[PDB]
Amino acid sequence: LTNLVAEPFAKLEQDFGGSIGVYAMDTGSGATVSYRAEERFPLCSSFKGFLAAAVLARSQQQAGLLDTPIRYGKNALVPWSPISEKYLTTGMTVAELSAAAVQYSDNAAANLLLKELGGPAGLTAFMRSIGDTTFRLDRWQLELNSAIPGDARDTSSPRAVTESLQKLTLGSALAAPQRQQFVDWLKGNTTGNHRIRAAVPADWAVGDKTGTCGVYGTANDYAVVWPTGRAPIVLAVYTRAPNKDDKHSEAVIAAAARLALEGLGVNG
Ligand SMILES: *C(=O)[C@@H](NC(=O)[C@H](N)c1ccccc1)[C@@H]1N[C@@H](C(=O)O)C(C)(C)S1
């Protein structure tokens, strides 16, 4: 049921000047679209969705975790921290940091939450615990964005991202209240309007998390999509390019998502 219908991903990545990795899953029939799906690509900020899921998992065992206030000093503010910078003088709750990391890709909030989980190895351990043997986080923001060609640190594959996203949003990896909260955070994301969402009709529900490393044409998005009248679709789109100063493209991510949906026979 893989690639029942061929799509021109090769021409798309050639026009972009890099590599594109795609894995899309129709959760009803099990049919898939797959292109470079088992290659490693840098996560960039897309790790933060899984970080929020790991926080929610912990909260099943710590009833008070989400409401815990976290205070932080100016030395915790990283470039691109649009929410946490407004609460420096007050603090934010764990739930609010999680929402900011997912929905604004707030870099300081993500580092604070990583600390709570025991750092990159603690997030990697959570992904191992849901059966993902590919994902690895090695460093913190912003060093994890280096996107060096051939470097396996801070990478996963489009396929493993999609498989883990499915387990967390639709499967049994989180208890039902935490599952819906993860979904609601993804649905409220603000940074993805020009990526997978641009290929999804306005009358369908969707949640996503983006990543943009800033170098090596490296950027990405993953999403769960609920077309009306059929089962949901889970997909991941990752890009990279050979030269440090190659620019990323939002349009190429949207175009790859359109091809994935066409390949699954989802009318959009
Ligand atoms: C994670 O990927 C973060 N990326 C960065 O901080 C980069 N230094 C950067 C690249 C391009 C423009 C500004 C910063 C954050 N997540 C990105 C995303 O979710 O697409 C981001 C651009 C919102 S910042």
Numbering used by the authors: 25 to 57, 59 to 252, 254 to 294
What do the authors report?
KPC-2 (Klebsiella pneumoniae carbapenemase-2) is a globally disseminated serine-β-lactamase (SBL) responsible for extensive β-lactam antibiotic resistance in Gram-negative pathogens. Carbapenems, the most potent β-lactams, evade the activity of many SBLs by forming long-lived inhibitory acyl-enzymes; however, carbapenemases such as KPC-2 efficiently deacylate carbapenem acyl-enzymes. In KPC-2 and other class A SBLs, the active site (containing the nucleophilic Ser70) is bordered by the flexible Ω-loop where the general base for deacylation (Glu166) resides. We present high-resolution (1.25–1.4 Å) crystal structures of KPC-2 acyl-enzymes with representative penicillins (ampicillin), cephalosporins (cefalothin), and carbapenems (imipenem, meropenem, and ertapenem) obtained utilizing an isosteric deacylation-deficient mutant (E166Q).
